[PDB]
């Protein structure tokens, strides 16, 4: 009985009491910095302690009067005429190179930013000092040097290259937004060294989609990071200007502040084997564990990008709730950019150059012999052979959408902090070698888990992960949330050793709790829940189902089905391997105890009887030959028939039986023979 023993499967739902903080509006951005955690939410900025998530201070960029002629940071509060709009924070960074300060960027306020200065004695006091970043562009009023942040969606990255604070910003642009104020799809800004504005180092330091394609060809950036003297961007966009189908793309260029010099774009895809996943939803840069590094061919110190890919609705970006996670060594993809692709896979960039333009009629590529040297006629190169990656969980999550991912290392293993759109958080050890059951699979909140999460790993033994679900920020220690939820011994032993607990004869328990001393994590006793049936004839070979778990000898992952045997008294029942599982057994063989023997231990079950079938009386005795009456039998996987025709079972029991006799064209009596898997002793005759 697979259904009845379902208690063996771990209880998917619990309530976990962890430090949790609530915000009056949903939180968009968050950063941890110097024992204070800064969270940006709609019209709100909170600062929290780590261990408490206590709201020690808050800054109020609440609703603002948006007026068409009001300049961004000037006080137009006296204007009574032109809507009390509200802003959302999408850019929240901390910088310390100039001073220990915070930078935030609003949405409605022309995408203009502000600065908070931390007093040395009390750094959490962010409301003390506020600057605006707004320098009136006297020389070039036509373009914005400080209109830096978009509203639909944007990404901002801070860097210190050549002792210079550089902000790499990618913007999602609408066609109607440019005429009021120009923007740039991808660009680099420098802070004025007096921290009072931005300037454009070069006209080449930005790329904006060509004016006809502002409405079409929408690009949404999902992530971006810095590594190996290069700035990598991860976005989602169409395959072609007229494709109406979407896929993940990445953007590479090194970190020269003069401008985007070697701007090269690359389609990416991860496949199952052969189904591809188009859209990336979350990404994280990290290092691989010793067990994983070899299996991905990556060095232990070499960086790895982990990304979740979900299959989108056809010819659209919205996922069909079919997702997976994949890994990308930065060295492999970098070499792929440098060497793997040939020439004719390279083309000009469509949305900037234009499909019909002079540069990509004929232009050689110094892509191998030269590394992003700042030339003048730099070529923005489009590839076409998308890099194909393989699944790491071989599609074990093929029907669930993933939206938030974090990854850490511990000992030699590496763990991924998975997140769902239904607010369930999983902890999984990632391994191509074998499917690993999530050791933590609870549900946090109704709201989808926010992609932006943070992990801190102090002294390699104490750490945490802050994750955002709607209006909740929650702390989750990586050291093992628990194992009491485990209740199958095989499942308890499948738990990674990083959390120290094991099985002691009743449930997966911590070492020092159960006092019996049976606490073991290498071997335990197999369990049987029930058996059907317990009433069989002495010679009757009846198929018995065995319900329980831990039915086989254990390997690291592959549960061995061959080290199983069955003993009934002294003889052995005919074990059927094709119907032998960890879940149930199917065997085909006076109360005796049935014994199951495994590589670990043996279980004795005391209630199985070779009941001798007894038939006593048949009614009625004499009558007509209609053959439609109720014939009743009684006594102590059964069948019963007369004249080669089975009497349909009108009633069955151990002590009562009743057939509706088949009609036969004869008025005499015959012996009615019971066939309970075998023709047993027959009863007396009944006249027809």
């Amino acid at each position: 009985c697979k259904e009845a023993l379902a208690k063996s499967e771990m209880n998917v739902n619990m309530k976990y009491q962890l430090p949790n903080f609530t915000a009056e509006t949903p939180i968009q951005n968050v950063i941890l910095h110097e024992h204070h955690i800064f969270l940006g939410a709609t019209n709100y900025i909170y600062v929290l302690n780590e261990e408490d998530l206590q709201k020690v201070a808050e800054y109020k960029t609440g609703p603002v009067l948006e007026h068409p002629d009001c300049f961004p940071c000037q006080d137009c509060s006296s204007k009574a005429n032109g809507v009390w709009k509200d802003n959302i924070n999408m850019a929240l960074v901390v910088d310390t190179y100039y001073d220990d300060q915070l930078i935030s960027c609003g949405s409605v306020n022309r995408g203009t930013c502000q600065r908070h200065v931390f007093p040395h004695n009390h750094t959490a006091d962010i409301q003390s000092e506020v600057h605006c970043i707004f320098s009136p562009q006297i020389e070039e009023p036509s373009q914005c040097p400080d209109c830096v942040v978009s509203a639909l969606g944007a990404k901002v990255l801070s860097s210190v290259k050549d002792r210079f604070i550089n902000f790499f910003v990618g913007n999602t642009i609408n066609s109607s937004y440019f005429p009021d104020h120009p923007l740039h799809s991808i660009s680099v800004r420098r802070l004025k060294e007096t921290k009072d504005g931005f300037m454009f180092l070069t006209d080449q330091s930005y790329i904006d989609v060509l004016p006809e394609f502002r409405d079409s060809y929408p690009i949404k950036y999902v992530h971006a990071f810095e590594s190996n003297n290069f700035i990598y961007f991860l976005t989602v966009q169409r395959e072609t200007l007229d494709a109406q189908t979407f896929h993940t793309r990445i953007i590479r260029f090194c970190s020269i502040n003069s401008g985007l010099h070697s701007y090269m774009e690359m389609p990416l895809e991860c496949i199952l084997t052969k189904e591809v996943f188009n859209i990336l939803q979350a990404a994280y840069v990290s290092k691989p564990g010793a067990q994983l590094a070899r299996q991905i061919g990556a060095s232990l110190n070499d960086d790895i990008l982990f990304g979740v890919f979900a299959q989108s609705k056809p010819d659209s970006a919205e996922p069909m709730d079919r997702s997976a996670m994949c890994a990308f060594p930065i060295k492999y993809v970098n070499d792929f950019f440098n060497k793997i692709v040939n020439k004719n896979n390279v083309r000009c960039l469509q949305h900037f150059y234009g499909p019909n333009h002079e540069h990509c009629f004929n232009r050689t590529l110094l892509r191998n012999s030269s590394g992003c040297e700042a030339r003048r006629d730099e070529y923005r190169t489009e590839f076409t052979t998308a890099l194909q990656r393989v699944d790491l969980f071989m599609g074990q999550f093929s029907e669930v959408l993933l939206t938030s991912i974090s990854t850490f290392i511990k000992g030699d293993l590496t763990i991924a902090n998975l997140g769902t759109s239904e607010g369930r958080f999983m902890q999984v050890v990632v391994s191509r070698s074998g499917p690993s059951t999530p050791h933590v699979n609870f549900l946090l909140d109704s709201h989808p888990v926010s992609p932006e999460v943070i992990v801190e790993h102090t002294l390699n033994q104490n750490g945490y992960t802050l994750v955002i679900t709607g209006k909740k920020i929650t702390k989750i220690p990586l050291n093992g949330l628990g194992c009491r939820h485990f209740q199958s011994c095989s499942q308890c032993l499948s738990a990674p050793p990083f959390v120290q607990c094991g099985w002691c004869h009743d449930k997966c328990v911590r070492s020092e709790e159960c006092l019996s001393g049976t606490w073991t994590q290498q071997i335990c006793l197999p369990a049987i829940y029930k058996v059907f049936p317990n009433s069989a004839p002495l010679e009757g070979g009846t198929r018995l189902t065995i319900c329980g778990w831990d039915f086989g000898f254990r390997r690291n992952n592959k549960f061995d089905l061959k080290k199983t045997r069955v003993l009934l008294g002294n003889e052995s029942c005919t074990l059927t391997l094709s119907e032998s599982t960890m879940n149930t057994l199917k065997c085909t063989v006076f109360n005796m105890s049935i014994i199951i023997s495994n590589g670990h231990g043996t279980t004795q079950y005391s209630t199985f009887s070779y009941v001798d079938p007894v038939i006593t009386s048949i009614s009625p005795k004499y009558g007509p030959m209609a053959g439609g009456t109720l014939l009743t039998l009684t006594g102590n996987s059964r069948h019963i028939s007369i004249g080669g025709k089975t009497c349909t079972l009108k009633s069955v029991s151990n002590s009562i039986l009743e057939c509706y006799t088949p009609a036969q064209t004869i008025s005499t009596e015959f012996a009615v023979k019971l066939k309970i898997d075998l023709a047993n002793r027959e009863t007396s005759i009944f006249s027809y």
Binding site: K274, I296, G297, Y332, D335, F336, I340, T385, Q388, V390
Partner: protein, 144 residues
């Protein structure tokens, strides 16, 4: 296109097989049949767009031709007409036959390569299966 090495997982990552299947002798780059799949020896291409393709490698019946007498033929086939393998002519199990290679040399009584000792139209050999007494060897006729 050159096969992708089975040790390096670029440009295609399904190359854990060197550790997945022991004794299957998938070499550094040579293409094998780790699963015994019906298509044949297939390898990953270093070419990015195509993942794996089956190597074109000929069958064994292509080189082994046949003459009417059959006894003159002494080739490399050691497979019967139903795919069974000829037992060792030096062996005496599972068939206690009559032909002894040292007693009867000069007729190619080698390990398992099919021979025509009794003047059959085709070579035949005793089956490695103890139940099957012997079986014929399927060979296409020669030319020129």
């Amino acid at each position: 296109i050159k096969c992708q090495p089975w040790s390096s997982m670029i440009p295609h990552e399904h190359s854990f097989l060197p550790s997945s299947y022991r004794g299957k002798d998938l070499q550094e780059n040579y293409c094998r049949n780790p699963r015994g799949e019906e298509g044949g020896p297939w390898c990953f291409t270093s070419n990015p767009e195509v993942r794996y393709e089956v190597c074109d490698i000929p069958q064994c019946s292509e080189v082994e031709c046949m003459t009417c007498n059959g006894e003159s033929y002494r080739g490399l086939m050691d497979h019967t007409e139903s795919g069974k393998i000829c037992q060792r002519w030096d062996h005496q199990t599972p068939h206690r036959h009559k032909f002894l290679p040292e007693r009867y040399p000069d007729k190619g009584f080698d390990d398992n390569y099919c021979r025509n000792p009794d003047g059959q139209p085709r070579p035949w050999c005793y089956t490695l299966d103890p139940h099957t007494r012997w079986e014929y060897c399927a060979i296409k006729t020669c030319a020129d």
